[PDB]
Design a protein around this ligand. Sequence first.
Ligand code: SF4
Ligand code: SF4
Ligand code: FES
Lengths: 672, 107, 83, 169, 90, 46
Amino acid sequence: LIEVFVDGQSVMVEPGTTVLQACEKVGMQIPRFCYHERLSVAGNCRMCLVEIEKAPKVVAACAMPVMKGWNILTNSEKSKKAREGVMEFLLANHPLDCPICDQGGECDLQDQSMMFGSDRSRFLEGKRAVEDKNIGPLVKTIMTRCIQCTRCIRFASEIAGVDDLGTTGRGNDMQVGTYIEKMFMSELSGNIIDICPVGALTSKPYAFTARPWETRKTESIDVMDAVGSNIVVSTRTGEVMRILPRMHEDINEEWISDKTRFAYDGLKRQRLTQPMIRNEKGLLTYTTWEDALSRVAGMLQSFQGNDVAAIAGGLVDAEALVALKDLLNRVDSDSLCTEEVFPTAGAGTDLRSNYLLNTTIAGVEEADVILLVGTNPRFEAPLFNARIRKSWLHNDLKVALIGSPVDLTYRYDHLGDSPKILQDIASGNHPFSQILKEAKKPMVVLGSSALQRSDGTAILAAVSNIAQNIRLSSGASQVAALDLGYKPGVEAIRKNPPKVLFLLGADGGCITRQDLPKDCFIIYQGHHGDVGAPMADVILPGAAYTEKSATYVNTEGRAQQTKVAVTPPGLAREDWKIIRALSEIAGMTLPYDTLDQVRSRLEEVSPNLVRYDDVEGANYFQQANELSKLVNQQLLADPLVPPQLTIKDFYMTDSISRASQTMAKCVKAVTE
Amino acid sequence: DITTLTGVPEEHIKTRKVRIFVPARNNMQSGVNNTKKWKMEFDTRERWENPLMGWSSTADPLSNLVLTFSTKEDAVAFAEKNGWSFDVEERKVPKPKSKSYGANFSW
Amino acid sequence: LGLREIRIHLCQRSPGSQGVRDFIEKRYVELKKANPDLPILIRECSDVQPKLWARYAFGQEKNVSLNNFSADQVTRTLENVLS
Amino acid sequence: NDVVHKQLSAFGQYVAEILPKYVQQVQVSCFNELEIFIHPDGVIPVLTFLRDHTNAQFKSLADLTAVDVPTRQNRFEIVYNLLSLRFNSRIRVKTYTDELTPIESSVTVYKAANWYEREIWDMFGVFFANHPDLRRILTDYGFEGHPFRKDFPLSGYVELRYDDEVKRV
Amino acid sequence: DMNEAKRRVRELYRAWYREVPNTVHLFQLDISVKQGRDKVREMFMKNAHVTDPRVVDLLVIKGKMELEETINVWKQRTHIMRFFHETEAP
Amino acid sequence: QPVSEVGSRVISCDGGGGALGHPRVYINLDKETKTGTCGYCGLQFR
Ligand code: SF4
Ligand code: SF4
Ligand code: FES
């Protein structure tokens, strides 16, 4: 690895690698725009010019790789005159919009103008200005403030994969706006609002609402997905303003989804505020928190043993599940019922690893073949789709659909039908089984959607066999519960059990109220009036994920936590705490009371959750799990259709997203 | 431990926690300067609204407090001197990445 | 039939774990085939001393600590496991 | 001016050699402000000579500032300006101190420092030994916690208000 | 070392305790004459677990100044009645 | 207000006067299908 001199001191820099990366390695920071790691290099916007120790003319910092003991004077005066030189050109046309441009608080162009640009103007003519190009429900294009760091196109063609937008024209008048009126919708369309260098592209829904120096910037993680990406939520005092991605190598890496980016908006609208008993008329009616909780607290004692049946939503809630767990063991019998119709016989839970995504998503680029079965990756987990696409450019590795007609951005083999192509390749009937054989570190990915589909267990058995074959040849509200064994999780235990206890019936309340004629009563501990509330007696207001400290588990098994942000909106408390109240009322007061005591209870009942970033484990070994499941095996069927298919279907899932104004605006947008 | 020396009410050396970390880059920015150097943010508490004028009236004594540092060990030890509960978090420097203008022109 | 659940913890690297690690690669499937019934959760938790846990309808819990025990001893407390 | 930077430099060297049992370093801020360091135990002896002639007839403390910094093995960082008259020029010695170690008071050496000992005591934790009377000023009576501790909320932890039921603030 | 400092604090208790009735008299405080004493004992219980070497003597430094103030009639009825937190909601 | 119209193309709106109105900005008129509302002034153009 070559020696190279940053201005003075020697640095044993990595072979090749751009001068920019060299000074980045010494930590000195060159002024920049068009360049961006996690994107691509480009020669436009020559604000990065730096002076060679000897060679008379400056060269772009992100262009030339360092070599052979180079020295480079970043602070050299000629470099500085160069930078002023360029900056005056950039400012020769960017419109006087700082007070109104929504990028105004931290636009990189401002700070670069301060640190380097000459302060006097000496342009003295007429700026060009151009008409807007409407683009979708989200992004507020303004252009004119455009500076042709192509960047956004290099975003689109190289990550979103859509190449709808692009540069147009030559000289001045050239525009980064797409020709033709056509709207650009994509699942990574939101992140450009982050990526856009200036205010030329900024989020309409958040627009004008706030200014950057104002908002506090809490760190946490997303909940709209179990993908568990890190974020920086931003609040203007007692109220959330806008979400931004927080970079993290294992997951989001500087990116974020899109449904999550605008998910917060639903919090503002309909939401639980006070407990609501059914009145004698059957109407929902507002009530004291105390009489309500004491009411049900006495009500559920008669049915100690089985009968009572708590029901979680798809979003909730680690501390709530431990708390409710003791609620269920201090009572003699219980219903650990999630929502997804996930098969449990043969037990993937006890070994942990079967429900785990074994390789790290960070390890996905290492895999040489991917076997997507049943559900399209982009809607289910966009960041992962971004990851595999990322490697798709980085590597020529194969992937395959098993099976759907879904439109992933990149080239990939399409297969047929479940038991068919699956069991066939499992028995090496498929030619695809061969390429799966020669493949290094094969990756087979099975979606959650497949796990239901009438006979989920059969599908799991087929995919597991493929795993066995490869080895022989050689060469939310989900993963958390299975980290603590709340299987079946499915509501299939029934056996009708009186007095169900929703944590959030907004999801599973759409199903059926069949127990209700037997027992109309349903405690509802949600945070929206959606679905579950109207068909449920006794309502408990509850906190959203922004408030709660409660951890969530990455599908990899990483179990990182959200931090507090804006406190519960009204009389509502954090969810579990209602239960720690309830047990205390029942007389079966639980051992914990503080959040940290019950983190000590994760420190017993798991204690692998209390390792927030630590995915690694001893692993049960796939063959042993295979033997563990070997004693079952059952009849299968061909069809396998992922739930989402269309993007509009992606826009609405959990009740919070349907409480969103903007997501409604998007589903209206794509449909109209 | 210096809890007796500080006049701080017991409530706020007890029922709340510091949260040491090195701040993330604002992602809208391409800058890196503010990223470095440990700081010692406390946990948020309640903040309601003024019945009049709608102001964000607030109860907690010390929400806005924040402190820079040069080293993490110094920070942890710092809070320990104060007898403070803490949540130390890792520095998360980005992995170095390969870049090549010509790899764009493989074929 | 008082037990509802049973669980076991195991660090992947303490030596005192291997006498239990060895218990799992082979004895386990035999156990599940012998134990269709109640859940038998296994964890990779890096607690230095591997442990054992057992639910009741009461909520009271068996808590068996272990140190470097032979897998057959694991089997011993496991057969001491009863109704 | 180069000149002053010279004279201060050489003079810094001058004192650096005259009494180097304790002068950690004699940095000159480039805008003509000399400032030697001191081991905290060494405060009295240095300042003493600092009044005493050689050239260091730097009579009159201008001030006794107490910069705080949360890091460092010892946080509080005391500073002494000084002025010499006949050679009209100012220097600035300074030390460091534990939250708990009692550094001695310097009232005798610079004479007009009696008020300052009380100041820094009530704006900080730091104690000065051989001080005739530390006590609160610039505060309320009770109040307790020192301000300027670089932590400690500006809004403090308290408030007065008059209350009619007890007829008292 | 400890104990050498504990005697200091006992001395301090003697001083406070004996002074208290004079405090109630001179200040026209209508607190029950006992109550101040008890409250003194309580304030003395507030740090009744401190165990560091120097910190405790430092504690009696900060303890001197208060009796120092009440004896000089520095502070006032308000200021000395302040300890009882009497206006607070439970 | 009546919508001001000029046969040219690009125009500059200062909000009335020099240094007493909003920062000078040029409103483009690339699209005749719509008026050119000023950013600050709020005055349409075509
Ligand atoms: S964002 Fe565009 S307009 Fe607003 S200030 Fe920065 S540069 Fe000027
Ligand atoms: S789109 Fe964003 S990136 Fe592409 S030019 Fe306009 S501003 Fe620069
Ligand atoms: S990044 Fe070097 S030219 Fe713009």
